[PDB]
Write a protein that binds this ligand. Sequence first.
Ligand SMILES: [Mg+2]
Ligand SMILES: [Mg+2]
Lengths: 222, 194
Amino acid sequence: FAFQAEVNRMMKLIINSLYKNKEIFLRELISNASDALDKIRLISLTDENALAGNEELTVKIKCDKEKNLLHVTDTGVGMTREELVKNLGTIAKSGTSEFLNKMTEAQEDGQSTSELIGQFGVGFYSAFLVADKVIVTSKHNNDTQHIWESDSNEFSVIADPRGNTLGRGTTITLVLKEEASDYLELDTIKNLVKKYSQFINFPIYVWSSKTGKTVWDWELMN
Amino acid sequence: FQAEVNRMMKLIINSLYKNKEIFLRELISNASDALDKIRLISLTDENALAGNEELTVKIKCDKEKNLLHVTDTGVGMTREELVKNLTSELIGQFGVGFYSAFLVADKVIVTSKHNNDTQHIWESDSNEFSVIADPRGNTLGRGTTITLVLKEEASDYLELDTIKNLVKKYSQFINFPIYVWSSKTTVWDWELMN
Ligand SMILES: [Mg+2]
Ligand SMILES: [Mg+2]
């Protein structure tokens, strides 16, 4: 079944080329972190134990130029295993069969090419504009911490062997594409975060340097 | 096989709806960008606009020869750029980029004059492409004319009102004026669209 996948994975390397300002991926991840935070914040106004697993309400972004990773972590509501599998699984599972089905449905639905290419730039799936692989670690008050992985073709999920390390919340880890290396640059990340966090009701930080040796810590962006 | 996989994706891409009118949006876009580059340059290079003082986009229709002309007084392209700046085809299938012109044209002719070279003419039918120095010499001043030899089924674009509507439809946020060689009570002249 290697051929069909060759067409599939290729069909994307081409569509990903239509996006000039792929930076929007960060905007979508911020937005989701914001939603998750609003959900648990809202719940806490009715349930005094809701924040027990982790009292802070923040979004924290960090770059790992060595591993070529970008981490976006929020202490929002988090997702249960079922949620990772259905809310992310079906969303990011556009393999050989899924990809084709959406196209035929799009073919008969009348869904123009525009509406199609546009789907690549909105929501969680927009992460794939700059990443070959997305790893999602999440902990929701109603379940144990789990890990979900996908390369936009398939997805897998297993209980985090490390246990509850998030307290509550979600970390989005992006294994960046060679050409998306700019998103590993501190100056690039700070500017964008500052750009897309103007309307979040929560503090957004970026792990940064501050000079007396050079030390690193969370720098508030909004 | 590269060629194999390519055609495969091609039919697939076209197996979906796409209002071919989007070709114009793409030409308007490219013109706007060309004008931006020279506009900026003119802020540092005092005589950058010497070749042609205006910064515009003028659309002309020739229902006789079945041709659509999109001329801008942007930065233009040198012979090298013509050859170089002109995955692109597939991208064209999505109605994006220079190649979107082939969604409506069997042949595309590009005339361009850049301050650093002489006027040249580039020509292509999507398969092969040719380039030669313009016999007429420098007639654009500076800028680029995209000439589309429209496909029979695309002759609808040659209609005045159709082109005007399409232009207005995609020139709302362009930082430069866009005209269409129109007529009025008969008199003929350029008519602003944005
Ligand atoms: Mg979202
Ligand atoms: Mg373009």
